[PDB]
Structures are given as structure tokens and as C-alpha cells.
Amino acid sequence: PYSSPPTNLRSLRDRLTQVAERQGVVFGRLQRHVAMIVVAQFAATLTDDTGAPLLLVKGGSSLELRRGIPDSRTSKDFDTVARRDIELIHEQLADAGETGWEGFTAIFTAPEEIDVPGMPVKPRRFTAKLSYRGRAFATVPIEVSSVEAGNADQFDTLTSDALGLVGVPAAVAVPCMTIPWQIAQALHAVTAVLEEPKVNDRAHDLVDLQLLEGLLLDADLMPTRSACIAIFEARAQHPWPPRVATLPHWPLIYAGALEGLDHLELARTVDAAAQAVQRFVARIDRAT
Structure with missing residues (x-):
């Protein structure tokens, strides 16, 4: 030092x-x-x-x-x-x-x-x-x-x-921001349908949502559902619960967002990441 x-x-x-x-x-x-x-x-x-x-x-x-x-x-x-x-x-x-x-x-x-x-x-x-x-x-x-x-x-x-x-x-x-609300925001952003010539490039959110899921306390799952409901209804765009789709350019963009995270247990491909985040969405939706 x-x-x-x-x-x-x-x-x-x-x-x-x-x-x-x-x-x-x-x-x-x-x-x-x-x-x-x-x-x-x-x-x-x-x-x-x-x-x-x-x-x-x-x-x-x-x-x-x-x-x-x-x-x-x-x-x-x-x-x-x-x-x-x-x-x-x-x-x-x-x-x-x-x-x-x-x-x-x-x-x-x-x-x-x-x-x-x-x-x-x-x-x-x-x-x-x-x-x-x-x-x-x-x-x-x-x-x-x-x-x-x-x-x-x-x-x-x-x-x-x-x-x-x-x-x-x-x-x-x-x-x-607390994890429940960061989750709500990231889920909404990653499943949004973008306008006209603008294309959703947000595959990195799939990395972030896995990292958030890893950090989320099981006792904060109900608050996470509440937070998701609140954001999805406030923005009044696509409804809760979303489907976690992936776009044609996302495989490499997703792989790019993994830079420096080899030592973590993350999905290594965008398909696996989307499956992991969809399972998370279902688990959140069950926490009523």
C-alpha cells in the first residue's frame, strides 16, 4: 500500500x-x-x-x-x-x-x-x-x-x-437500487419490442439478470414479483409476465457480455441464458 x-x-x-x-x-x-x-x-x-x-x-x-x-x-x-x-x-x-x-x-x-x-x-x-x-x-x-x-x-x-x-x-x-427493482427494470428492458429501425441489442441484460438471480435472497422473491408487476403496469407496454425472446444477432452480443466471467456459473450461450431467465420469470411469477 x-x-x-x-x-x-x-x-x-x-x-x-x-x-x-x-x-x-x-x-x-x-x-x-x-x-x-x-x-x-x-x-x-x-x-x-x-x-x-x-x-x-x-x-x-x-x-x-x-x-x-x-x-x-x-x-x-x-x-x-x-x-x-x-x-x-x-x-x-x-x-x-x-x-x-x-x-x-x-x-x-x-x-x-x-x-x-x-x-x-x-x-x-x-x-x-x-x-x-x-x-x-x-x-x-x-x-x-x-x-x-x-x-x-x-x-x-x-x-x-x-x-x-x-x-x-x-x-x-x-x-x-435494491435487487427486486433492478430485476424488474432489466426484465422489462430485455423483453421490450423496439421501434421501427431501432433493434433491441440488449442481450447483456441476460447476463445481468443471471447475476441478479444469484444475489437475490429467496425471501425477496415476493417483493420481486411486486416490483415486476409495478414496472410492467406503470410503463404499460408489453404485459407481465414476459416471454424472454432472443434476436438473430444476440448469440455473439451475449457471448461478448461474458468477457471476464469464465470463473462464474453463467449460461455460456444465449439460448441457455434465455432458458435460465425464463425459468427465473416463472419462479418470480409464482411468488404471490
């Missing part, structure tokens, strides 16, 4: 190089993960007046936090759900980023709407540009969805020690 924090960006990167070497990880992916954790720390400072989180992490980023880098799909976006308007969330992130944390600062670009049906308020996408002690470090894509039903009524908190590995002492504890 290191006795002091990195003096400058050059030092931060060298330590990342050493930790990447050590940990058998590609530098760019480790940098990305550390950058995501810095953004998560800013997100975790956004609270309501009772101290409850305004932003909860979901999707690939939460899976990475729950399972660790080796046992999770390589995540791209920092996906979240927000309990306030995007202008407020963005502004508070901007304030936190300017104040900084452990030498890191961030500016946040303009939130842009993503077209998604079934949502009165559509999700927003922007970027955090991070610096370390005044010098550009990395950029992180962020996506923010509006609350649906009870999907932000509770949260789990996941801690990462990744910053410690480069001599930055503070632990980062990150509030995340």
Missing part, C-alpha cells in the same frame, strides 16, 4: 498502472472503475433534508459494486435513478464536483433526453469530466432515470475500497 495520496495526476496514473499490473486488469478498465467511484462519491453527497439519498446507482455500475470487478460485467455507464428533477440533480452534482473530494473535481455536461416509451419523464444522459488536483483525469458517461413506483423507496449500500489501492484513504459507500 501507499502511505500518502498521489501528489499529482502523473502519480495517480502510475499507481493505477502498478495496481492494474498487480490485479491482472487492463489499465483503461481500472481507470474507468476508479473514475466511476469518484462520481459515485459525489452522487452519494446528494441527500434530501433527512439525509436520504437523492440518487441511487443501478444497472452495470451497481452490479460492479455488488459483485466486484472480477465477478461482474464490464460496465460502461454510471446509470442512476433520481428522486428530484434533473436540473436540481445536475446542479447539486455540479456543486459537489466544484467543491471536490480527495483532490478530485468534476464538471458535468448538459443533460440530454433519451427516447424511452412508458415514462412520463424520459431519462437524461450527460458526462462527468473529472480532474485530479486541477488536471484532467477521465470522463464518465452518466444516465439518470426518474423514479418509478417504489424503485427509490429503499436502497442497499455498497462500499468500494478501490481508491485505497492508490493511497486515497477514504472509503466510498454508494447507495444502490
Whole structure:
């Protein structure tokens, strides 16, 4: 370990190089993960007046936090759900980023709407540009969805020690969407029928749903059914329960999403993955 924090960006990167070497990880992916954790720390400072989180992490980023880098799909976006308007969330992130944390600062670009049906308020996408002690470090894509039903009524908190590995002492504890609600969202997304020229490329959700199933406590199955019902009815698109179909290009896209997960007991082919997720859907549907 290191006795002091990195003096400058050059030092931060060298330590990342050493930790990447050590940990058998590609530098760019480790940098990305550390950058995501810095953004998560800013997100975790956004609270309501009772101290409850305004932003909860979901999707690939939460899976990475729950399972660790080796046992999770390589995540791209920092996906979240927000309990306030995007202008407020963005502004508070901007304030936190300017104040900084452990030498890191961030500016946040303009939130842009993503077209998604079934949502009165559509999700927003922007970027955090991070610096370390005044010098550009990395950029992180962020996506923010509006609350649906009870999907932000509770949260789990996941801690990462990744910053410690480069001599930055503070632990980062990150509030995340609970597994029942992440399951509801992923099932809806993976079984959605997309519009016109747009084609569902979401085979990776089949990986995520298997990882979520592995983490789900048997006593949270009834809440999972409730959560699924709530999302499927709120969005009012395809009905519950869905059929887990796979599209012609999904075999290779699915196989791509398995990168770095050999040591896990996952379906190794998209057909097997679809069968596994369909069995999960049936088990959830039985939990009335």
C-alpha cells in the first residue's frame, strides 16, 4: 500500500498502472472503475433534508459494486435513478464536483433526453469530466432515470475500497437500487419490442439478470414479483409476465457480455441464458 495520496495526476496514473499490473486488469478498465467511484462519491453527497439519498446507482455500475470487478460485467455507464428533477440533480452534482473530494473535481455536461416509451419523464444522459488536483483525469458517461413506483423507496449500500489501492484513504459507500427493482427494470428492458429501425441489442441484460438471480435472497422473491408487476403496469407496454425472446444477432452480443466471467456459473450461450431467465420469470411469477 501507499502511505500518502498521489501528489499529482502523473502519480495517480502510475499507481493505477502498478495496481492494474498487480490485479491482472487492463489499465483503461481500472481507470474507468476508479473514475466511476469518484462520481459515485459525489452522487452519494446528494441527500434530501433527512439525509436520504437523492440518487441511487443501478444497472452495470451497481452490479460492479455488488459483485466486484472480477465477478461482474464490464460496465460502461454510471446509470442512476433520481428522486428530484434533473436540473436540481445536475446542479447539486455540479456543486459537489466544484467543491471536490480527495483532490478530485468534476464538471458535468448538459443533460440530454433519451427516447424511452412508458415514462412520463424520459431519462437524461450527460458526462462527468473529472480532474485530479486541477488536471484532467477521465470522463464518465452518466444516465439518470426518474423514479418509478417504489424503485427509490429503499436502497442497499455498497462500499468500494478501490481508491485505497492508490493511497486515497477514504472509503466510498454508494447507495444502490435494491435487487427486486433492478430485476424488474432489466426484465422489462430485455423483453421490450423496439421501434421501427431501432433493434433491441440488449442481450447483456441476460447476463445481468443471471447475476441478479444469484444475489437475490429467496425471501425477496415476493417483493420481486411486486416490483415486476409495478414496472410492467406503470410503463404499460408489453404485459407481465414476459416471454424472454432472443434476436438473430444476440448469440455473439451475449457471448461478448461474458468477457471476464469464465470463473462464474453463467449460461455460456444465449439460448441457455434465455432458458435460465425464463425459468427465473416463472419462479418470480409464482411468488404471490
